[PDB]
Amino acid sequence: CFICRQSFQNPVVTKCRHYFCESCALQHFRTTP
Amino acid sequence: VIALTGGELVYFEMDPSGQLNEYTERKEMSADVVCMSLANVPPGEQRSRFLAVGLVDNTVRIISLDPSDCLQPLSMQALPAQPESLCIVEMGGFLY
């Protein structure tokens, strides 16, 4: 990953190519939608 | 598809010539459920639907329960607070 800078723990996508780790991007949605 | 306290659970289908049966493949899903909803198509000699479940945590979940790729989550979610309701529908002349 490159938000949490970890290994790709379910590198999973959004509308617009943004592959994030799964629970980390859920916590990112908890931070900002 | 019905649940108990728990989660992703039993189907409890029927037989096309006879009575009810089940799948004993369960996920059992640490609890997190407020709502579930589905919808069925006018064709289909098969499973022929899609599963949507709403969880106590700030999340819903859609799972295709076709026998190939069964109880395996398909695409993810985002919601602010809690759903308390779900529905699947088709309205035109894309499943909304």
Short mmCIF file of N, CA and C in Angstrom, two decimals:
data_model
loop_
_atom_site.label_atom_id
_atom_site.label_comp_id
_atom_site.label_asym_id
_atom_site.label_seq_id
_atom_site.Cartn_x
_atom_site.Cartn_y
_atom_site.Cartn_z
N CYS A 1 0.83 -1.20 0.00
CA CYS A 1 0.00 0.00 0.00
C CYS A 1 0.86 1.25 0.00
N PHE A 2 0.21 2.41 -0.11
CA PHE A 2 0.95 3.66 -0.03
C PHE A 2 0.22 4.71 0.80
N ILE A 3 -0.86 4.34 1.50
CA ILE A 3 -1.38 5.18 2.57
C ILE A 3 -0.74 4.71 3.87
N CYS A 4 -0.98 3.44 4.22
CA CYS A 4 -0.37 2.85 5.40
C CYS A 4 1.03 2.32 5.13
N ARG A 5 1.47 2.32 3.86
CA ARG A 5 2.81 1.90 3.42
C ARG A 5 3.11 0.46 3.84
N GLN A 6 2.10 -0.39 3.78
CA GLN A 6 2.21 -1.79 4.14
C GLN A 6 2.20 -2.66 2.89
N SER A 7 2.23 -3.97 3.12
CA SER A 7 1.99 -4.91 2.04
C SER A 7 0.53 -4.85 1.63
N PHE A 8 0.25 -5.34 0.43
CA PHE A 8 -1.04 -5.11 -0.21
C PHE A 8 -2.05 -6.08 0.38
N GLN A 9 -2.67 -5.65 1.48
CA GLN A 9 -3.67 -6.42 2.22
C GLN A 9 -5.03 -6.18 1.59
N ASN A 10 -5.42 -7.09 0.68
CA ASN A 10 -6.51 -6.90 -0.27
C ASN A 10 -6.35 -5.56 -0.98
N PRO A 11 -5.44 -5.43 -1.95
CA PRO A 11 -5.37 -4.18 -2.72
C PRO A 11 -6.61 -4.05 -3.58
N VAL A 12 -7.53 -3.20 -3.14
CA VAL A 12 -8.88 -3.17 -3.69
C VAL A 12 -9.21 -1.74 -4.09
N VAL A 13 -10.12 -1.61 -5.06
CA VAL A 13 -10.15 -0.45 -5.94
C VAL A 13 -11.36 0.44 -5.62
N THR A 14 -11.40 1.62 -6.23
CA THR A 14 -12.54 2.52 -6.21
C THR A 14 -12.93 2.78 -7.66
N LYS A 15 -13.74 3.81 -7.89
CA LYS A 15 -14.17 4.18 -9.24
C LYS A 15 -13.00 4.45 -10.18
N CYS A 16 -11.94 5.06 -9.67
CA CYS A 16 -10.99 5.81 -10.48
C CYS A 16 -9.55 5.36 -10.22
N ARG A 17 -9.30 4.04 -10.32
CA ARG A 17 -8.01 3.35 -10.35
C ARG A 17 -7.39 3.25 -8.94
N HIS A 18 -8.02 3.78 -7.90
CA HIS A 18 -7.36 3.91 -6.60
C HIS A 18 -7.40 2.59 -5.85
N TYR A 19 -6.33 1.80 -5.99
CA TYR A 19 -6.17 0.52 -5.29
C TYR A 19 -5.61 0.76 -3.89
N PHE A 20 -6.43 0.55 -2.87
CA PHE A 20 -6.01 0.66 -1.48
C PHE A 20 -6.17 -0.68 -0.77
N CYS A 21 -5.51 -0.82 0.37
CA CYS A 21 -5.80 -1.94 1.25
C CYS A 21 -7.19 -1.79 1.85
N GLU A 22 -7.80 -2.93 2.16
CA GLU A 22 -9.25 -2.99 2.35
C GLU A 22 -9.70 -2.29 3.63
N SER A 23 -9.28 -2.81 4.78
CA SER A 23 -9.72 -2.24 6.05
C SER A 23 -9.06 -0.89 6.30
N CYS A 24 -7.89 -0.67 5.70
CA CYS A 24 -7.25 0.63 5.80
C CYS A 24 -8.02 1.69 5.02
N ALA A 25 -8.62 1.33 3.88
CA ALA A 25 -9.44 2.31 3.17
C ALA A 25 -10.82 2.43 3.79
N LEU A 26 -11.28 1.40 4.50
CA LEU A 26 -12.49 1.56 5.31
C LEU A 26 -12.26 2.56 6.44
N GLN A 27 -11.10 2.48 7.08
CA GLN A 27 -10.75 3.48 8.09
C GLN A 27 -10.47 4.84 7.45
N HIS A 28 -10.04 4.85 6.19
CA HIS A 28 -9.89 6.10 5.46
C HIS A 28 -11.25 6.74 5.20
N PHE A 29 -12.26 5.93 4.86
CA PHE A 29 -13.62 6.43 4.73
C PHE A 29 -14.16 6.91 6.07
N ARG A 30 -13.73 6.26 7.16
CA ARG A 30 -14.03 6.78 8.50
C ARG A 30 -13.35 8.11 8.75
N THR A 31 -12.19 8.34 8.11
CA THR A 31 -11.52 9.63 8.22
C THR A 31 -12.18 10.66 7.31
N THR A 32 -12.15 10.41 6.00
CA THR A 32 -12.76 11.30 5.02
C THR A 32 -13.43 10.48 3.91
N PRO A 33 -14.64 10.86 3.49
CA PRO A 33 -15.39 10.00 2.55
C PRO A 33 -14.81 9.97 1.15
N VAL B 1 -32.67 -16.93 1.59
CA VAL B 1 -31.52 -16.81 2.49
C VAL B 1 -32.01 -16.22 3.80
N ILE B 2 -31.93 -16.97 4.89
CA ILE B 2 -32.26 -16.44 6.20
C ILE B 2 -31.03 -16.50 7.09
N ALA B 3 -31.02 -15.68 8.12
CA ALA B 3 -29.92 -15.64 9.07
C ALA B 3 -30.42 -16.01 10.46
N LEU B 4 -29.46 -16.25 11.35
CA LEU B 4 -29.71 -16.37 12.78
C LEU B 4 -28.74 -15.39 13.42
N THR B 5 -28.64 -15.41 14.75
CA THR B 5 -27.65 -14.56 15.40
C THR B 5 -26.27 -15.08 15.03
N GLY B 6 -25.51 -14.23 14.36
CA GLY B 6 -24.48 -14.68 13.45
C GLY B 6 -24.66 -13.89 12.18
N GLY B 7 -24.84 -14.54 11.04
CA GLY B 7 -24.68 -13.80 9.81
C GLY B 7 -24.92 -14.60 8.55
N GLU B 8 -23.93 -14.57 7.65
CA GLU B 8 -23.94 -15.35 6.42
C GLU B 8 -24.11 -16.82 6.74
N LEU B 9 -25.27 -17.35 6.38
CA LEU B 9 -25.79 -18.61 6.88
C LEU B 9 -26.60 -19.27 5.79
N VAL B 10 -27.48 -20.16 6.26
CA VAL B 10 -28.29 -21.11 5.51
C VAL B 10 -29.04 -20.48 4.35
N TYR B 11 -29.25 -21.26 3.30
CA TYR B 11 -30.10 -20.86 2.19
C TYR B 11 -31.52 -21.38 2.40
N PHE B 12 -31.65 -22.69 2.64
CA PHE B 12 -32.91 -23.41 2.78
C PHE B 12 -33.77 -23.27 1.51
N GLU B 13 -33.25 -23.85 0.43
CA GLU B 13 -34.02 -23.94 -0.81
C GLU B 13 -34.99 -25.11 -0.76
N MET B 14 -35.53 -25.43 -1.93
CA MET B 14 -36.51 -26.48 -2.12
C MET B 14 -36.03 -27.45 -3.20
N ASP B 15 -36.91 -28.39 -3.56
CA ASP B 15 -36.65 -29.22 -4.74
C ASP B 15 -37.60 -28.83 -5.86
N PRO B 16 -37.12 -28.75 -7.10
CA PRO B 16 -38.01 -28.38 -8.21
C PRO B 16 -39.08 -29.41 -8.53
N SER B 17 -38.99 -30.62 -7.99
CA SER B 17 -40.08 -31.57 -8.06
C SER B 17 -40.67 -31.90 -6.70
N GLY B 18 -40.04 -31.44 -5.61
CA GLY B 18 -40.41 -31.88 -4.27
C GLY B 18 -40.19 -30.83 -3.21
N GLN B 19 -39.64 -31.26 -2.07
CA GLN B 19 -39.67 -30.54 -0.81
C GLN B 19 -38.38 -29.76 -0.58
N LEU B 20 -38.22 -29.26 0.64
CA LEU B 20 -37.11 -28.39 0.98
C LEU B 20 -35.81 -29.17 1.17
N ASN B 21 -34.70 -28.44 1.10
CA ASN B 21 -33.36 -28.92 1.44
C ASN B 21 -32.55 -27.73 1.93
N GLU B 22 -31.22 -27.87 1.95
CA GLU B 22 -30.36 -26.83 2.50
C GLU B 22 -28.98 -26.93 1.86
N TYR B 23 -28.17 -25.89 2.08
CA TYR B 23 -26.72 -26.00 2.00
C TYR B 23 -26.12 -25.93 3.39
N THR B 24 -25.21 -26.85 3.68
CA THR B 24 -24.46 -26.86 4.92
C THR B 24 -23.14 -26.10 4.82
N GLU B 25 -22.94 -25.34 3.75
CA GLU B 25 -21.80 -24.43 3.65
C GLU B 25 -22.22 -23.11 4.28
N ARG B 26 -21.63 -22.80 5.43
CA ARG B 26 -21.94 -21.60 6.18
C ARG B 26 -20.67 -20.79 6.35
N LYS B 27 -20.83 -19.50 6.60
CA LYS B 27 -19.72 -18.60 6.90
C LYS B 27 -19.72 -18.14 8.35
N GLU B 28 -20.91 -17.87 8.89
CA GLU B 28 -21.26 -17.69 10.30
C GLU B 28 -20.80 -16.36 10.91
N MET B 29 -19.98 -15.58 10.19
CA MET B 29 -20.04 -14.12 10.11
C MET B 29 -20.28 -13.38 11.42
N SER B 30 -19.22 -13.16 12.21
CA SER B 30 -19.26 -12.40 13.47
C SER B 30 -20.19 -11.20 13.39
N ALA B 31 -21.14 -11.16 14.33
CA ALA B 31 -22.57 -11.07 14.00
C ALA B 31 -22.95 -10.04 12.96
N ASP B 32 -22.97 -8.75 13.34
CA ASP B 32 -23.11 -7.60 12.44
C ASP B 32 -24.21 -7.76 11.40
N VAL B 33 -25.47 -7.75 11.82
CA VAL B 33 -26.57 -7.74 10.86
C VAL B 33 -27.72 -6.87 11.37
N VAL B 34 -28.21 -6.01 10.47
CA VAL B 34 -29.40 -5.20 10.70
C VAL B 34 -30.45 -5.48 9.63
N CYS B 35 -30.02 -5.73 8.39
CA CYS B 35 -30.95 -6.00 7.30
C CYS B 35 -30.30 -6.90 6.25
N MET B 36 -31.16 -7.61 5.52
CA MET B 36 -30.80 -8.31 4.29
C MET B 36 -31.93 -8.14 3.30
N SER B 37 -31.61 -8.15 2.00
CA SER B 37 -32.63 -8.08 0.97
C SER B 37 -32.07 -8.66 -0.32
N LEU B 38 -32.98 -9.13 -1.18
CA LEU B 38 -32.61 -9.73 -2.45
C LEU B 38 -33.74 -9.44 -3.44
N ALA B 39 -33.58 -9.93 -4.67
CA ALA B 39 -34.62 -9.86 -5.69
C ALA B 39 -34.39 -10.96 -6.70
N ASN B 40 -35.47 -11.44 -7.31
CA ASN B 40 -35.39 -12.60 -8.20
C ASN B 40 -35.91 -12.23 -9.59
N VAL B 41 -35.31 -12.87 -10.58
CA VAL B 41 -35.50 -12.57 -12.00
C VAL B 41 -36.63 -13.43 -12.56
N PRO B 42 -37.31 -13.01 -13.63
CA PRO B 42 -38.39 -13.83 -14.20
C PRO B 42 -37.89 -15.09 -14.91
N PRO B 43 -36.67 -15.10 -15.56
CA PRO B 43 -36.11 -16.42 -15.91
C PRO B 43 -35.37 -17.06 -14.75
N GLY B 44 -34.69 -18.16 -15.03
CA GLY B 44 -33.84 -18.79 -14.04
C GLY B 44 -34.27 -20.18 -13.66
N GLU B 45 -33.61 -21.17 -14.28
CA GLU B 45 -33.61 -22.55 -13.81
C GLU B 45 -32.41 -22.82 -12.91
N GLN B 46 -31.96 -21.80 -12.19
CA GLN B 46 -30.73 -21.83 -11.42
C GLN B 46 -31.01 -20.98 -10.17
N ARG B 47 -29.95 -20.58 -9.47
CA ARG B 47 -30.07 -19.73 -8.28
C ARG B 47 -30.69 -18.37 -8.63
N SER B 48 -30.05 -17.62 -9.53
CA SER B 48 -30.68 -16.56 -10.33
C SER B 48 -31.20 -15.39 -9.48
N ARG B 49 -30.29 -14.79 -8.72
CA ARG B 49 -30.57 -13.67 -7.83
C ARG B 49 -29.23 -13.07 -7.42
N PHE B 50 -29.25 -12.13 -6.47
CA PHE B 50 -28.05 -11.60 -5.82
C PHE B 50 -28.33 -11.27 -4.37
N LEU B 51 -27.34 -11.50 -3.52
CA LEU B 51 -27.50 -11.30 -2.08
C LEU B 51 -26.96 -9.93 -1.71
N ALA B 52 -27.73 -9.18 -0.92
CA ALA B 52 -27.25 -7.97 -0.28
C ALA B 52 -27.58 -8.04 1.20
N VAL B 53 -26.57 -7.82 2.05
CA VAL B 53 -26.71 -7.89 3.49
C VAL B 53 -26.24 -6.57 4.08
N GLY B 54 -26.90 -6.13 5.15
CA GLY B 54 -26.51 -4.91 5.83
C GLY B 54 -26.07 -5.24 7.25
N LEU B 55 -24.96 -4.63 7.68
CA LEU B 55 -24.27 -5.09 8.86
C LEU B 55 -24.40 -4.04 9.95
N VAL B 56 -24.20 -4.43 11.21
CA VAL B 56 -24.34 -3.49 12.33
C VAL B 56 -23.26 -2.43 12.26
N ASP B 57 -22.04 -2.85 11.92
CA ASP B 57 -20.96 -1.92 11.62
C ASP B 57 -21.30 -1.13 10.35
N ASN B 58 -20.56 -0.06 10.11
CA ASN B 58 -20.86 0.90 9.04
C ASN B 58 -20.53 0.29 7.68
N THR B 59 -21.33 -0.70 7.28
CA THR B 59 -21.02 -1.54 6.12
C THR B 59 -22.25 -2.30 5.66
N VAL B 60 -22.36 -2.44 4.34
CA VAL B 60 -23.23 -3.42 3.69
C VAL B 60 -22.31 -4.33 2.89
N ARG B 61 -22.89 -5.27 2.16
CA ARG B 61 -22.10 -6.28 1.47
C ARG B 61 -22.98 -6.98 0.45
N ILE B 62 -22.49 -7.08 -0.78
CA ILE B 62 -23.19 -7.85 -1.80
C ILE B 62 -22.38 -9.11 -2.08
N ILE B 63 -23.07 -10.24 -2.10
CA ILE B 63 -22.46 -11.54 -2.33
C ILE B 63 -23.29 -12.27 -3.37
N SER B 64 -22.63 -12.75 -4.41
CA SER B 64 -23.26 -13.63 -5.38
C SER B 64 -23.15 -15.05 -4.84
N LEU B 65 -24.27 -15.74 -4.77
CA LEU B 65 -24.38 -17.07 -4.19
C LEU B 65 -24.71 -18.11 -5.26
N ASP B 66 -24.23 -17.88 -6.48
CA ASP B 66 -24.20 -18.93 -7.49
C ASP B 66 -23.32 -20.08 -6.99
N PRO B 67 -23.61 -21.33 -7.39
CA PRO B 67 -22.90 -22.48 -6.78
C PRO B 67 -21.40 -22.50 -7.04
N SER B 68 -20.97 -22.17 -8.25
CA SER B 68 -19.63 -21.66 -8.44
C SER B 68 -19.59 -20.24 -7.88
N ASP B 69 -18.58 -19.96 -7.04
CA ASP B 69 -18.46 -18.72 -6.27
C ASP B 69 -19.67 -18.52 -5.36
N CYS B 70 -19.77 -19.40 -4.36
CA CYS B 70 -20.80 -19.34 -3.33
C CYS B 70 -20.21 -18.95 -1.99
N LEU B 71 -20.94 -18.10 -1.26
CA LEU B 71 -20.55 -17.47 0.01
C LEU B 71 -19.21 -16.74 -0.11
N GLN B 72 -18.99 -16.15 -1.27
CA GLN B 72 -17.73 -15.44 -1.47
C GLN B 72 -18.05 -14.00 -1.85
N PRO B 73 -17.61 -13.03 -1.04
CA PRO B 73 -18.02 -11.64 -1.25
C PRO B 73 -17.46 -11.06 -2.54
N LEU B 74 -18.26 -10.21 -3.17
CA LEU B 74 -17.99 -9.78 -4.53
C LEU B 74 -17.51 -8.34 -4.61
N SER B 75 -18.25 -7.39 -4.04
CA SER B 75 -17.79 -6.01 -4.05
C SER B 75 -18.21 -5.33 -2.75
N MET B 76 -17.44 -4.32 -2.40
CA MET B 76 -17.45 -3.73 -1.07
C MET B 76 -18.38 -2.51 -1.02
N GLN B 77 -18.22 -1.69 0.01
CA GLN B 77 -19.27 -0.81 0.50
C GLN B 77 -18.67 0.49 1.01
N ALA B 78 -19.56 1.40 1.41
CA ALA B 78 -19.32 2.51 2.32
C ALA B 78 -20.67 3.08 2.74
N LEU B 79 -20.86 3.28 4.04
CA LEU B 79 -22.03 3.98 4.55
C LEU B 79 -21.65 4.70 5.83
N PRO B 80 -22.28 5.85 6.12
CA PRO B 80 -21.92 6.57 7.35
C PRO B 80 -22.37 5.94 8.67
N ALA B 81 -23.65 5.64 8.87
CA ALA B 81 -24.10 5.31 10.22
C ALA B 81 -24.64 3.90 10.39
N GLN B 82 -25.80 3.55 9.80
CA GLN B 82 -26.40 2.21 9.87
C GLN B 82 -27.54 2.13 8.87
N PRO B 83 -27.64 1.04 8.09
CA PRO B 83 -28.64 1.00 7.02
C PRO B 83 -30.10 0.78 7.44
N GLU B 84 -30.36 -0.20 8.30
CA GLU B 84 -31.68 -0.57 8.84
C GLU B 84 -32.68 -1.05 7.79
N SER B 85 -32.29 -1.14 6.52
CA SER B 85 -33.17 -1.42 5.39
C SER B 85 -32.28 -1.66 4.18
N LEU B 86 -32.78 -2.47 3.25
CA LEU B 86 -32.14 -2.70 1.97
C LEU B 86 -33.23 -3.08 0.98
N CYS B 87 -32.98 -2.83 -0.30
CA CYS B 87 -33.88 -3.34 -1.34
C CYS B 87 -33.15 -3.43 -2.67
N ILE B 88 -33.57 -4.40 -3.47
CA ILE B 88 -33.11 -4.59 -4.84
C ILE B 88 -34.35 -4.59 -5.72
N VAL B 89 -34.27 -3.92 -6.87
CA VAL B 89 -35.45 -3.75 -7.69
C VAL B 89 -35.03 -3.51 -9.14
N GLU B 90 -35.91 -3.82 -10.08
CA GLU B 90 -35.74 -3.40 -11.46
C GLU B 90 -37.02 -2.74 -11.93
N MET B 91 -36.88 -1.59 -12.58
CA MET B 91 -38.00 -0.69 -12.79
C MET B 91 -38.24 -0.29 -14.24
N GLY B 92 -37.25 -0.39 -15.12
CA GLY B 92 -37.41 0.03 -16.49
C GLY B 92 -38.28 -0.91 -17.31
N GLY B 93 -38.27 -0.68 -18.62
CA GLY B 93 -39.09 -1.45 -19.53
C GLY B 93 -38.59 -2.86 -19.80
N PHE B 94 -27.54 -2.15 -13.26
CA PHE B 94 -28.78 -1.43 -13.49
C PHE B 94 -29.88 -1.88 -12.54
N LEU B 95 -29.54 -2.76 -11.60
CA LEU B 95 -30.52 -3.34 -10.69
C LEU B 95 -30.77 -2.50 -9.44
N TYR B 96 -30.37 -1.23 -9.46
CA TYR B 96 -31.02 -0.15 -8.70
C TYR B 96 -31.03 -0.40 -7.19
#
